[PDB]
């Protein structure tokens, strides 16, 4: 609200991410949960480090289950 | 569950504290500011990242509000962040005022007249509405051109309608039945 | 206004709209770019609607814009639908280009009121001995072909279509719900080659299609039949499998946030069935005569889905796996099949006495069967030995070769008039043909043929 | 690095580690004050891992320090194992002294 509160926000250095990239949140029983893949399509293939590949099955509101 | 159910403990905690320390007006401003900051698109995006710890997210929000939060408010912010509830700040801010209003013995009414507005008219009804409700009334008059002639008075779950649209509705169901 | 996809899970999609522009229940939505339709099933709150895709979701993404159409799925109706194959959305699924519609109706509708129902008992002849005897159909009545997997539901329905639809002067709607795509192709070429395709509207939703398609295909076919009924016409409505409508609701129910009921079924099993079944009726304007095939999970007639279906029908024909396992077709169970037209005041005392006579003989033999297995035949009384012979013959005389089954039977098809059906069974019950070997009644159309088969 | 027991429910234990030092699945962990061994089953997020105890959990409490070993449970193999009795972790349980192992192999392959 207050211009002072309006500021500090442009100095938080809030990062950003491409719509075709995301990051792993948890790893359990062959299921991986990923954050940020906004352009993922159901059934699309996800590339992880090491040449491991996954398949997006749960496109939930704030997490992708692969 | 309803955001209200999840915000009830946090809000009652803020209120019992503000009351026993005579801070019922300071926390209103602090909660309104915290609610406001959290809704901004840049802050909303920041709070939804897996890289930050609960303390880091909590700290970043106290820094943007700064003086707006007294020692206690900043600690309350740390409790909300620790429990991962920073998405409920607008709801937490709303329910605090409701507990406060019942304490101050007041109501925010929302009057809607058809085509006329006068300083005499607002008080003329604030006396009866106050008498009926047994509370002080902070009227918030507005304009509703949809109505042919009359006013609709909303206070809490009570809705005293004296609008001609209301008499039209009655006459219509009566004539078709 | 415009909405954004917020959550895709299988066939279920959530779309968020402005809180002042939330689309209505059952409203149709269109995804931008992708060719996909979503029907609102629930209003979760905060401008979000829960919907089911009428297509595939492999190409759908979060954030795609969705458009509100302001109405439910609107399909073409009237004369333009005759001789055409269509999908759930009413699009043509044949290469004959577009359909010249002059009106579109919404698939969702209220059932006719209590004052609009009409009562009639005109007897409809089928040409099958077991049905014409114990399950007499009536014009404007509801028929159900109950049975498990591989006992004859499709074959029997095709024979009826042939013995009724081909002669029927009025129009006809055929709805393939959760059917094999091969059966739909064989039937289309059959209606086309028989020159009867001109008076039959074809709607197909096979097993390869998404749950939403199989959940609304029945409402599309029924909407076309209702337009014709309301014009004052007499219509025939054939549904390949109405169970697939219930199953599509079970497949999607849990993703819609509904707790499961007994035998893992949707908690709305009886209402979802009543809402469809009450529209398939003959009012005071025109008459819909309908034949539905009803799948019975694991051959158990007590399963909630089959058990909830019996109360909606006038004629109930039951097919038995134990009869089919003995090389007997049609495998109708005379002691389990029933009809409202089976009443001396509706047909006649001679027909009724013959039917009850056959049932009495078969019911008594069901208990002597085990007695003969343990011990032996010799230990029976003469009346029981004499009864066992007639029962085994009547069971065989119920078998009739059908033209649609010639590919499987190898023999020519036969058509038996109810008169021959009554005459033959009466004679066997009298004991006139007690001089014929048991093997002579198997697949022999009329009793006369049986007398000839005994000489070969 | 070193984590802290954050949760205990029967044979299953949750341990929190710094975000740059989270143990991999099947990595073996040792509790500092009792030397009880834990095997990591899954990574839950926020630096928290879930593990199964390779012994009794009676007497363990929240806040105890846990050490990551950098490898899966590794057991002795070869001629030195003949005529000897061993437990799940490859320790001798026959009172005949230590095993003359030349090499150890991980139990997951
Ligand atoms: N009347 C019949 N004559 C010969 N074969 C039949 C008959 N009824 C069913 N069948 C056999 O069963 C199949 C066709 O029955 P169908 O209608 O598909 O059964 P259901 O629909 O109950 O699964 C074919 O394999 C066919 O050999
Ligand atoms: Mg079939």
DSSP string of D7-75? EEETTEEEEE--TTSPPPTT-EEEETTT--EEEEEEEEETTEEEEEESS--TT--TT-EEEE-SS--EE
Residue C37 CA to residue C13 CA, distance in Å, equals 11
C57 touches chain A (CB under 8 A): yes
What would the DSSP string read from start to end of B29-40? Answer: HHHHHHHHHHHS
Calculate how far, in angstroms, residue C225's C-alpha sits from the geometric centre of ligand 2.
Answer: 23
User: How far, in Å, CA of C449 to CA of C329, rounded?
Assistant: 17
| Structure determination method | cryo-EM
Q: Is C150 annotated as a binding residue?
A: yes
Taking Cα atoms as reference points, which of C366, C402, C375 lies closest to residue C127? C402
Distance CA C54, CA C58 (A): 13
Nearest Cα to Cα of residue D39 among D76, D77, D102, D89: D89
- Residue A62, classed as helix, strand or coil, is coil
For residues C11 and C210, give the distance between their C-alpha atoms in angstroms, rounded to a whole number: 7
Question: Touch between chain B and chain A (3+ CB pairs, < 8 Å)?
Answer: yes
State the Cα–Cα distance between residues D71 and C303, nearest whole angstrom: 54
Which protein residue's CA is at the shortest distance from atom 19 of ligand 1?
C152
The region, left, alpha or beta by phi > 0 then psi within -120 to 50, assigned to residue C257 is left
**How would you write chain C as a 3-class SS string?**
CEEEEEEEECCEEEEECCCCCCCCCCCEEEECCCCCEEEEEEEEECCEEEEEECCCCCCCECCCEEEECCCCCEEECCHHHCCCEECCCCCECCCCCCCCCCCEEECCCCCCCHHHECCCCCEECCCCHHHHHHCCEECCCEEEEEECCCCCHHHHHHHHHHHHHCCCCCEEEEEEECCCHHHHHHHHHHHHHCCCHHHEEEEEECCCCCHHHHHHHHHHHHHHHHHHHHCCCEEEEEECCCHHHHHHHHHHHCCCCCCCCHHHCCCCHHHHHHHHHCCCCCECCCEEEEEEEEECHHHCCCCHHHHHHHHHCCEEEEECHHHHCCCCCCCECCCCCEECCCCCCCCCHHHHHHHHHHHHHHHHHHHHHHHHHCCCCCCCCHHHHHHHHHHHHHHHHCCCCCHHHHHHHCCCCCCCCHHHHHHHHHHHHHCCCCCCCHHHHCCCCCHHHHHHHCCC
* DSSP code for D86: B
Burial of residue C90 (number of CB atoms within 10 Å: 0-12, 13-18, 19+): buried
Return d(Cα C230, Cα C225) in angstroms, integer.
Answer: 9
What is the Å distance from ligand 2's center to C151 Cα? 8
Atom of ligand 1 nearest to the CA of C155: 17
User: For C347, phi and psi rounded to 5 degrees?
Assistant: -110, -75
Assess contact for C329 and C130: CB atoms under 8 A.
no
For C194-219, give the secondary structure using H, E and C. Answer: CCCHHHEEEEEECCCCCHHHHHHHHH
Inter-residue contact B69 to B14 (CB < 8 Å): no
D2: helix, strand or coil: strand
- Nearest-angstrom CA–CA distance, C174 and C163: 15
Chains D and C are touching, with contact defined as 3 or more CB–CB pairs separated by less than 8 Å: no
What b-and-e string marks burial along C159-180, b requiring 16 or more CB atoms within 10 Å of the CB?
A: bbbbbbbeebeebbbbbbbbbe
Residue B76 near residue B15 (C-beta atoms within 8 A): no
**Comparing C-alpha atoms, which of C65, C55, C82 is closest to residue C2?**
C65
Element at A45 (helix H, strand E): strand A45-47
The whole-angstrom separation of Cα C137 and Cα C337 is: 12
Q: How far apart are CA C112 and CA C225, in angstroms?
A: 14
- Give the largest CA-CA distance in chain D: 46
CA-CA distance, C331 to C214, in Å (whole number)? 28
| Beta-ladder partners of C123 | C138
**Which residues have CB under 8 Å from C198's CB, separation 6+?**
C82, C83
Between CA C160 and CA C235 the distance in angstroms is: 15
Give yes or no for a contact between C85 and C94, defined as CB atoms under 8 angstroms apart.
yes
Contacting partners of chain D (3+ CB pairs under 8 A): A, B
Q: Which chains touch C (3 or more CB pairs under 8 A)?
A: A
What is the dihedral sign for C-alpha A64, B2, B3, B9?
negative
Would the annotation count C413 as a binding residue? no
Residues in chain A: 66
Q: With beta carbons less than 8 A apart as the criterion, state whether A37 and A54 touch.
A: no
For helices C243-253 and C269-277, the axis angle rounded to 10 degrees is: 140
**Any atom of ligand 1 within 6 Å of the Cβ of C23:** no
The span from the CA of B63 to the CA of C401, in Å, is: 88
Report the C-alpha gap between D66 and D17 in whole angstroms: 9
> Integer distance in angstroms from the first to the last C-alpha of chain A?
40
Asked whether the CA dihedral A31, A33, A37, A41 is positive or negative, the reply is positive
Question: Counting atoms of ligand 1 from 1, which one is nearest the CA of C154?
Answer: 17
CA of A34: how far to CAs of A21, A27, A38, A59, B86, in Å?
Answer: 10, 10, 11, 10, 21
CA gap B37, A5 in Å, rounded:
8
- What are residue C137's phi and psi, to 5 degrees? -80, 160
CB contact burial B58-76 (16+ within 10 A = b; e otherwise) = bebbbebbeebbeebbbeb
Q: Say how far apart CA D52 and CA D50 lie, in whole Å.
A: 7
Instruction: For residue B107, give the H/E element and its range.
Output: strand B106-107
Q: Confirm if B140 and B124 have CB atoms less than 8 A apart.
A: no
Give the separation between CA C324 and CA C151, rounded to whole angstroms.
6
Please check whether residue C204 is in contact with residue C241, taking contact to mean a CB–CB distance below 8 angstroms.
no
Q: Residue C236's beta-bridge partner residues?
A: C172, C289
Q: Of the candidates C321, C315, C3, which has an alpha carbon nearest to the alpha carbon of residue C150?
A: C321
Smallest CA–CA distance, residue A6 to chain D, in Å, is 30
- Decide: C405 in ligand 1 pocket, CB within 6 A: yes
Distance CA B166, CA B163 (A): 5
Are the C-beta atoms of C174 and C224 separated by less than 8 Å? no
Question: Looking at chain B, how many residues does it have?
Answer: 177
C170 is in an annotated binding site: no
């Amino acid at each position: 609200i207050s211009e002072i509160i309006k500021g500090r926000i442009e100095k938080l250095d809030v990062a950003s991410q491409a719509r075709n990239e995301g990051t792993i949140v948890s790893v359990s029983d062959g299921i991986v949960r990923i954050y940020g893949l906004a352009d993922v399509m159901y059934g699309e293939m996800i590339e992880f480090p090491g040449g491991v590949y996954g398949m997006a099955l749960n496109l939930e509101q704030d997490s992708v289950g692969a | 569950a309803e955001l209200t159910t999840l915000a009830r403990p946090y809000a009652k905690a803020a209120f019992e504290y503000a009351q026993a320390h005579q801070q019922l007006a300071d926390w209103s401003a602090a909660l309104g500011v915290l609610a406001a900051v959290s809704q901004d698109d840049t802050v909303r995006q920041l709070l939804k990242e897996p890289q930050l710890t609960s303390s880091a997210k909590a700290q970043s929000l106290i820094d943007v509000c700064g003086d707006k939060l007294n020692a206690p408010a900043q600690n309350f912010v740390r409790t909300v962040a620790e429990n991962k509830r920073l998405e409920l700040l607008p709801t937490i801010a709303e329910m605090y005022e409701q507990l406060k209003a019942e304490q101050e013995k007041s109501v925010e009414v929302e009057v809607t007249s058809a085509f006329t507005l006068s300083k005499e008219q607002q008080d003329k009804l604030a006396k009866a509405l106050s008498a009926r409700l047994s509370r002080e009334v902070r009227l918030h008059a507005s304009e509703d051109a949809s109505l042919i002639g009359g006013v609709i008075i909303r206070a809490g779950d009570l809705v005293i309608d004296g609008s001609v649209r209301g008499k039209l509705a009655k006459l219509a169901e009566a004539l078709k039945s | 206004s415009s909405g954004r996809i917020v959550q895709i899970i299988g066939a279920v999609i959530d779309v968020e709209f402005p809180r002042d522009a939330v689309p209505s229940i059952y409203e149709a939505l269109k995804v931008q770019g992708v060719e996909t339709t979503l029907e609102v099933q629930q209003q979760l709150g905060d401008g979000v609607v829960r919907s089911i895709a009428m297509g595939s979701t492999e190409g759908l993404k979060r954030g795609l814009n969705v458009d509100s159409t302001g109405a439910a799925i609107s399909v073409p109706v009237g004369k333009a639908t005759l001789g055409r194959i269509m999908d759930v959305l009413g699009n043509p699924i044949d290469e004959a280009g577009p359909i010249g519609e002059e009106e579109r109706w919404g698939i969702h509708r209220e059932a006719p009121s209590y004052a609009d129902q009409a009562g009639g008992n005109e007897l409809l002849e089928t040409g099958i001995k077991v049905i014409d005897l114990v399950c007499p159909f009536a014009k404007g009545g509801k028929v159900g072909l109950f049975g498990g997997a591989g006992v004859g539901k499709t074959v029997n329905m095709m024979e009826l279509i042939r013995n009724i639809a081909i002669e029927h002067s009025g129009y006809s709607v055929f709805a393939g719900v959760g059917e094999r795509t091969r059966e739909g192709n064989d039937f289309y070429h059959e209606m086309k080659d028989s020159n009867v395709l001109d008076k039959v509207a074809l709607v197909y939703g096979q097993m390869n299609e998404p749950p939403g398609n199989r959940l609304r295909v029945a409402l599309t076919g029924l909407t076309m039949a209702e337009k014709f009924r309301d014009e004052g016409r007499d219509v025939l409505l054939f549904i390949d499998n109405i169970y697939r409508y219930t199953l599509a609701g079970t497949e999607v129910s849990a993703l819609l946030g509904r707790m499961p009921s007994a035998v893992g079924y949707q908690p709305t099993l009886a209402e979802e069935m009543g809402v469809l079944q009450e529209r398939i009726t003959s009012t005071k304007k025109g008459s819909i005569t309908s034949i539905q095939a009803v799948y019975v999970p694991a051959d158990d007639l007590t399963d909630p889905s089959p058990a909830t279906t019996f109360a909606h029908l006038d004629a109930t024909v039951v097919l038995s796996r134990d009869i089919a396992s003995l090389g007997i077709y049609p495998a109708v169970d005379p002691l389990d099949s029933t009809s409202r037209q089976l009443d001396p005041l509706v047909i006649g005392q001679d027909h009724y006495d013959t039917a009850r006579g056959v049932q009495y003989v078969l019911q008594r033999y069901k208990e002597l069967k085990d007695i003969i297995a343990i011990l032996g035949m010799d230990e029976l009384s003469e009346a029981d030995k004499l009864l066992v012979a007639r029962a085994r013959k009547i069971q065989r005389f119920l078998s009739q070769p059908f033209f649609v089954a010639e590919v499987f039977t190898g023999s020519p098809g036969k058509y038996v008039s109810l008169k021959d059906t009554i005459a033959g069974f009466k004679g066997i019950l009298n004991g006139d043909y007690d001089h014929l070997p048991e093997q002579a009644f198997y697949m022999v159309g009329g009793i006369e043929e049986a007398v000839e088969k005994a000489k070969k």
